[PDB]
Ligand binder design. Structure first.
Ligand SMILES: [Mg+2]
Ligand SMILES: [Mg+2]
Ligand SMILES: [Mg+2]
Ligand SMILES: [Mg+2]
Ligand SMILES: [Mg+2]
Ligand SMILES: [Mg+2]
Ligand SMILES: [Mg+2]
Ligand SMILES: [Mg+2]
Ligand SMILES: [Mg+2]
Ligand SMILES: [Mg+2]
Ligand SMILES: [Mg+2]
Ligand SMILES: [Mg+2]
Ligand SMILES: [Mg+2]
Ligand SMILES: [Mg+2]
Ligand SMILES: [Mg+2]
Ligand SMILES: [Mg+2]
Ligand SMILES: [Mg+2]
Ligand SMILES: [Mg+2]
Ligand SMILES: [Mg+2]
Ligand SMILES: [Mg+2]
Ligand SMILES: [Mg+2]
Ligand SMILES: [Mg+2]
Ligand SMILES: [Mg+2]
Ligand SMILES: [Mg+2]
Ligand SMILES: [Mg+2]
Ligand SMILES: [Mg+2]
Ligand SMILES: [Mg+2]
Ligand SMILES: [Mg+2]
Ligand SMILES: [Mg+2]
Ligand SMILES: [Mg+2]
Ligand SMILES: [Mg+2]
Ligand SMILES: [Mg+2]
Ligand SMILES: [Mg+2]
Ligand SMILES: [Mg+2]
Ligand SMILES: [Mg+2]
Ligand SMILES: [Mg+2]
Ligand SMILES: [Mg+2]
Ligand SMILES: [Mg+2]
Ligand SMILES: [Mg+2]
Ligand SMILES: [Mg+2]
Ligand SMILES: [Mg+2]
Ligand SMILES: [Mg+2]
Ligand SMILES: [Mg+2]
Ligand SMILES: [Mg+2]
Ligand SMILES: [Mg+2]
Ligand SMILES: [Mg+2]
Ligand SMILES: [Mg+2]
Ligand SMILES: [Mg+2]
Ligand SMILES: [Mg+2]
Ligand SMILES: [Mg+2]
Ligand SMILES: [Mg+2]
Ligand SMILES: [Mg+2]
Ligand SMILES: [Mg+2]
Ligand SMILES: [Mg+2]
Ligand SMILES: [Mg+2]
Ligand SMILES: [Mg+2]
Ligand SMILES: [Mg+2]
Ligand SMILES: [Mg+2]
Ligand SMILES: [Mg+2]
Ligand SMILES: [Mg+2]
Ligand SMILES: [Mg+2]
Ligand SMILES: [Mg+2]
Ligand SMILES: [Mg+2]
Ligand SMILES: [Mg+2]
Ligand SMILES: [Mg+2]
Ligand SMILES: [Mg+2]
Ligand SMILES: [Mg+2]
Ligand SMILES: [Mg+2]
Ligand SMILES: [Mg+2]
Ligand SMILES: [Mg+2]
Ligand SMILES: [Mg+2]
Ligand SMILES: [Mg+2]
Ligand SMILES: [Mg+2]
Ligand SMILES: [Mg+2]
Ligand SMILES: [Mg+2]
Ligand SMILES: [Mg+2]
Ligand SMILES: [Mg+2]
Ligand SMILES: [Mg+2]
Ligand SMILES: [Mg+2]
Ligand SMILES: [Mg+2]
Ligand SMILES: [Mg+2]
Ligand SMILES: [Mg+2]
Ligand SMILES: [Mg+2]
Ligand SMILES: [Mg+2]
Ligand SMILES: [Mg+2]
Ligand SMILES: [Mg+2]
Ligand SMILES: [Mg+2]
Ligand SMILES: [Mg+2]
Ligand SMILES: [Mg+2]
Ligand SMILES: [Mg+2]
Ligand SMILES: [Mg+2]
Ligand SMILES: [Mg+2]
Ligand SMILES: [Mg+2]
Lengths: 46, 98
RNA sequence: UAUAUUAAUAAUGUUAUGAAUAAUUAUUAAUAAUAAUAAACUAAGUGAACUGAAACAUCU
RNA sequence: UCAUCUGAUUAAUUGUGGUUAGUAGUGAAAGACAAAUCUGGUUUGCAGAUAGCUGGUUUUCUAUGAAAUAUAUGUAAGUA
RNA sequence: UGCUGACAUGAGUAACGAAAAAAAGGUAUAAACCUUUUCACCUAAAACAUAAGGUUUAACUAUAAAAGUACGGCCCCUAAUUAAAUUGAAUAUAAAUAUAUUUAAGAUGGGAUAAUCUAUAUUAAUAUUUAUCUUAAAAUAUAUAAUUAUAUUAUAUAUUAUAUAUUUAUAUAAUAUAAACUAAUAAAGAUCAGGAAAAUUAAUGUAUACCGUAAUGUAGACCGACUCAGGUAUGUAAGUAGAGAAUAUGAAGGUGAAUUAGAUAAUUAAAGGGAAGGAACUCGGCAAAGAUAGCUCAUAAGUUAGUCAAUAAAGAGUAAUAAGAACAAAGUUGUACAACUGUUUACUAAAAACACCGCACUUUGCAGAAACGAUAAGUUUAAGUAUAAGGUGUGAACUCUGCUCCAUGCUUAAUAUAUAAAUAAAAU
RNA sequence: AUAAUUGAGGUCCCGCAUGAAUGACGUAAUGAUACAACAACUGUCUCCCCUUUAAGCUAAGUGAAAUUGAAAUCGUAGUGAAGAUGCUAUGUACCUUCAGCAAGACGGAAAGACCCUAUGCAGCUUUACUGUAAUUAGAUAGAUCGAAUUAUUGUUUAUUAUAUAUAAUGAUAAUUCUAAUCUUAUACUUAAUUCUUAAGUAAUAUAUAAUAUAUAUAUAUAUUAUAUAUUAUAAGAGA
RNA sequence: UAAUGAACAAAUAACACUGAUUGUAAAGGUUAUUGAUAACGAAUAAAAGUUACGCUAGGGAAGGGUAAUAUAGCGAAAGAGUAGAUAUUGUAAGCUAUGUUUGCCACCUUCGACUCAACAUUUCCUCUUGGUUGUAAAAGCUAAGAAGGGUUUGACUGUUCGUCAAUUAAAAUGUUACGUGAGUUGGGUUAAAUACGAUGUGAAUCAGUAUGGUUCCUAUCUGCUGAAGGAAAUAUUAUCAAAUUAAAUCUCAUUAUUAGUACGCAAGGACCAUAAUGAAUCAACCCAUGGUGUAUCUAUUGAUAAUAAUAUAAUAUAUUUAUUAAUAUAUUAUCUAUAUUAGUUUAUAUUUUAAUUAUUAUCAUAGUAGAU
RNA sequence: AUACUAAAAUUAAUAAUUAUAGGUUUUAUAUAUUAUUUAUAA
């Protein structure tokens, strides 16, 4: 069937699995949070 | 239908038809053949009708004379179940039926 | 409810039934807590493969 | 897309959440799917991996100017 | 087929993306915007309310109004599940971390009061899914307390007239269409045996928090590179007609499009009809054509006895005897493969391949086999116990499954038997 | 069976090269599976014709794409890195277009398709080579982590049999005991509100000594005294 | 003239050369000898296959040449031909031509069907002619000139081919990238799926079998089919126009007459020529016939909307009557509301004034049938 | 006649002659009722 519509939005899932606390509350999540910060990125997380 | 040509099960007219005692039955969780890692440790096991794991006595420590009131069918056991009622205390219980 | 709790006091209202008593207003003593905090350098543990050997396994 | 065709009370369809994935999951089993297609994804790093292979390598004038044979080679697209 | 920027050719060519429009006026500025009328399309939607999503795109900055009584979130409670959290020394592990117990979080779920409108706080004491069948009786029609047939099997609130505390409530008695449909107890059939968690009184008390609210939401307002014929959850979805949410019209609503105006050449696509033949076409009846009820009867051979065959083919009853909407409805047989319903190659293979119920072998006695665990604790197996669980092959059923363990394994018995590691002591 | 059949069905069997759970054979139903036959039906065909709508064409507005060494881009024969718009000879052709056709420009782009090379890559197989998880076995001739009894047998010493016994030292097998291991379940008072130490005594449990009673030196009960405890208890495996 | 093997690592003995603080030693060194790398200049002490599920970097590290083969001819004539090699036939050997089959070299990396065909003649039929003790006639055999016209429809198979059936005058042979996929189809052939037979220990494989299975293009240039504009015209315009150039056509069969004549014992049965019927192909036409005919008319099922007439009610303007009532005209409307136990629809009663006819219209494939 | 082109017909309204398309009239065709009937008067 037709494809391309893989991203079906949902604020709950988007925030729960890519949000700031979804990464600030884990070792691996924190590591990528600080890596983006060191690179100088404005938007640390979702 | 062709699916009924080999449907064959024993009929026991004496088996209970009502629901079991809620005070003993507890919910049976479905793991899907998956261990705490999430992987399927045991294969070929999957979803099915919802069930309640009955609590059947397998020790019978307390003892004393007891009378059976109804012989029921346990969805989680190949054997039947008997609801015992103590002749003095009146406590109820389930035991593997003979 | 830290503009907080307990205790004391002056008053009010005020139950209770002069005194008590809490509620309130206002004073004084005690009771309590705020982690974004760098990178590189150093040391320690585990530790590859591509590659070279014009192949490859000891070796690198 | 249209016509035609199949199931349509079930091993059915579907909404909202959750678990399982990179030697690695799910799989009524097709080497099917894991964010437009997996005999094993993507990103960063080792890393300018290696390439006896292909392509490219920029102004002028002057003098000399070949070979494609022999030997050896896991060697016949290479090299001495 | 070098990287970046600018500009050419294809070329003013293809295309402008399902479509009905017309006049008059705003406006001696309009095919494209607004209004009025006519016509048309969608109408169990292209309408009306919503959920999620989103550059607020809306009838807009002077903008989306909540104590609650059908208003949701918020808050209490938990499911699946998650957790740098808790437990001289919980257990395990090169670190990372994993496991078990607690605690906390987590809706897609549960949460008394209410138009005769209602009051949530503080203190003290003690329900899986599924049907409403048959008899009975009342009441009715033809017949004579007997018989045939017939709507009904239970509630939903108005009026009249009476009795109670006294024109507020209850009770009684009588009257009051049919077809759907709604929530509540009732009654009862099957195995596939059907969630978790958070009290009553007595007194006192309530000045009603925060957030959501526009419009689009079967789409120009979301996911699809696009104002993309694709994907997107829920409830009503006028009537007429029907068994029906099929099919035909359409009341009301919305709507008629970033392309227009002429002739419609050859040719292409989607449709309508076609004389005489009727498969001669073609790899192959691919495509197209073919329907004499849709209700009530009737319905063979074979057969695993199952109207399976079967919606049997032909046939009959109801006005039709020349026809006049749409939808449902498209024959018979032999053979090969597979028992059948199902699954499969998202995007060239849907099958004879996978699964299947059934048959057969084998491992495991639970302090177990099987699987996972840089590797263990431990987890699934299972809150199960040989009629159970794991693995293997075949694959419903009728008639059957003959022979041989040579080779690779498996399994039982034999010190028959070599060899590694580990050690003393003692000779050259 | 058809006018005629390499297709279909039945039958026969030198089965190149069937055969019984890699199941064998014959059925009923099922099948959008594959092949074949009959009836109807038809524009599939003889043989194509007419008609409608959206394009195609024209005018207005907007406006891509693959491709492109430069082009002033004809035919035939010959030649040629072997099939010429471009070389040689010769012929034809006034300049520019529009709607069509699709024979060539070895037409264009995805992407075709097969070979050979690389001391290239990846998956899969195995009695290819080399390791390894896993499983199995030994180390009182290693550790954690010790003993007793019984039975068979090996070798030897004093004593014997002949031209067979005792004893010592081991090994094998079984059985038993355990604080080896391992599994499973559940009061007062002083000294430093709660915690801790400490002399004394209360009560429970265990062990020893003495006294008294009752049965066949031994068993059972009671009292006195001394010592310890306030992780254990129960079950299982066990050197 | 062949009777062979490098280093490395080890082994044995001899020399007295070093001896890692010194003395020894250990160890190395020089000399002599030993064992095979046969892929024999020997990559390690130690290594086989499968891939159609495949991937990357590269090279090609039907046309063309040849003509053994194949087709055809020529020279000579052994032998058949009742007689006679040369009417017809023509062993084996010889000389050639073509590149239509099977091959060989490596310069160069899709069979069949549908549609349209163009070209050659090595002529299948039609036209003229020579030979034929084997031309009596008619049918025939062989050969020469001849390419103007023509050269099939079905069953089977994916087939070209081939067998068969029914016709014809005949159902010829080739070339054109074995013509024609930027023209169509795609049945065979091959890629992913699956199964059977055989091979293999298997993974998989087959000059095997069977079911299923993706291609696309808007034409710039050449060329071609049609249509225009500019132009240079033995120099204008309107009209008529010959030679010429390009191309189309060119036929074939049956019957009848000659004539049952010629020929022939008989059977059978003419040449030469003419006419009439047709076949195939092409061009033109719509008077008539069939088709179509979204021109049109009629019939008909369901639903909705509208115009006119009539009845009712209200408003407005004129007239009569007495702001009432009535006539004329115009406009507007045929609603609504309550009850029948909760909701919706309908039905009836209740309230109001809430009408019947006639003729249209739209939708259902042009709704559908019959005509035209 | 035709894709756009091109060809062909008319563009008369005057002292006289000229019809290109639409419309109108006549005749005819088609469709389908009609003699039980159409227009008129006496
Ligand atoms: Mg995307
Ligand atoms: Mg998730
Ligand atoms: Mg299993
Ligand atoms: Mg290397
Ligand atoms: Mg079915
Ligand atoms: Mg169905
Ligand atoms: Mg059911
Ligand atoms: Mg495969
Ligand atoms: Mg991707
Ligand atoms: Mg895949
Ligand atoms: Mg490196
Ligand atoms: Mg590189
Ligand atoms: Mg020189
Ligand atoms: Mg040279
Ligand atoms: Mg070599
Ligand atoms: Mg070389
Ligand atoms: Mg090379
Ligand atoms: Mg460049
Ligand atoms: Mg063009
Ligand atoms: Mg064009
Ligand atoms: Mg266009
Ligand atoms: Mg206007
Ligand atoms: Mg519908
Ligand atoms: Mg309706
Ligand atoms: Mg809406
Ligand atoms: Mg909670
Ligand atoms: Mg909720
Ligand atoms: Mg909203
Ligand atoms: Mg709203
Ligand atoms: Mg859309
Ligand atoms: Mg978007
Ligand atoms: Mg309407
Ligand atoms: Mg709308
Ligand atoms: Mg549009
Ligand atoms: Mg016809
Ligand atoms: Mg007919
Ligand atoms: Mg045929
Ligand atoms: Mg044919
Ligand atoms: Mg069909
Ligand atoms: Mg029968
Ligand atoms: Mg149908
Ligand atoms: Mg058979
Ligand atoms: Mg099947
Ligand atoms: Mg099926
Ligand atoms: Mg597919
Ligand atoms: Mg398919
Ligand atoms: Mg089973
Ligand atoms: Mg295990
Ligand atoms: Mg089993
Ligand atoms: Mg099988
Ligand atoms: Mg069976
Ligand atoms: Mg089978
Ligand atoms: Mg057998
Ligand atoms: Mg040893
Ligand atoms: Mg035959
Ligand atoms: Mg056939
Ligand atoms: Mg057969
Ligand atoms: Mg077998
Ligand atoms: Mg059958
Ligand atoms: Mg234009
Ligand atoms: Mg040439
Ligand atoms: Mg020249
Ligand atoms: Mg072309
Ligand atoms: Mg074209
Ligand atoms: Mg090489
Ligand atoms: Mg060596
Ligand atoms: Mg010396
Ligand atoms: Mg020394
Ligand atoms: Mg030495
Ligand atoms: Mg080797
Ligand atoms: Mg294959
Ligand atoms: Mg050639
Ligand atoms: Mg002779
Ligand atoms: Mg010869
Ligand atoms: Mg000739
Ligand atoms: Mg003759
Ligand atoms: Mg001539
Ligand atoms: Mg060809
Ligand atoms: Mg050919
Ligand atoms: Mg096989
Ligand atoms: Mg198919
Ligand atoms: Mg002329
Ligand atoms: Mg002539
Ligand atoms: Mg001709
Ligand atoms: Mg005609
Ligand atoms: Mg005519
Ligand atoms: Mg006619
Ligand atoms: Mg006609
Ligand atoms: Mg409509
Ligand atoms: Mg004039
Ligand atoms: Mg005229
Ligand atoms: Mg005139
Ligand atoms: Mg006219």
């Amino acid at each position: 069937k037709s494809r391309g519509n893989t991203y079906q939005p949902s604020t709950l899932k988007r925030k729960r699995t890519f949000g700031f606390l979804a990464r600030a509350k884990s070792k691996q999540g924190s590591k990528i949070l600080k890596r983006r910060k060191l690179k100088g990125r404005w938007f640390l997380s979702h | 239908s062709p699916g009924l040509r080999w449907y064959r099960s024993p009929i026991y007219p004496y088996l209970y038809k009502g629901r079991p005692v809620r005070a003993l039955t507890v919910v049976r969780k479905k793991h899907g053949g998956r261990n705490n890692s999430g992987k399927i440790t045991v294969r070929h096991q999957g979803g099915g009708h919802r069930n309640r794991t009955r609590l059947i006595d397998f020790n019978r420590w307390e003892g004393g004379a007891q009378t059976v009131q109804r012989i029921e069918y346990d969805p989680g056991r190949s054997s039947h179940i008997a609801l015992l009622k103590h002749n003095t205390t009146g406590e109820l219980s389930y035991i593997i039926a003979c």
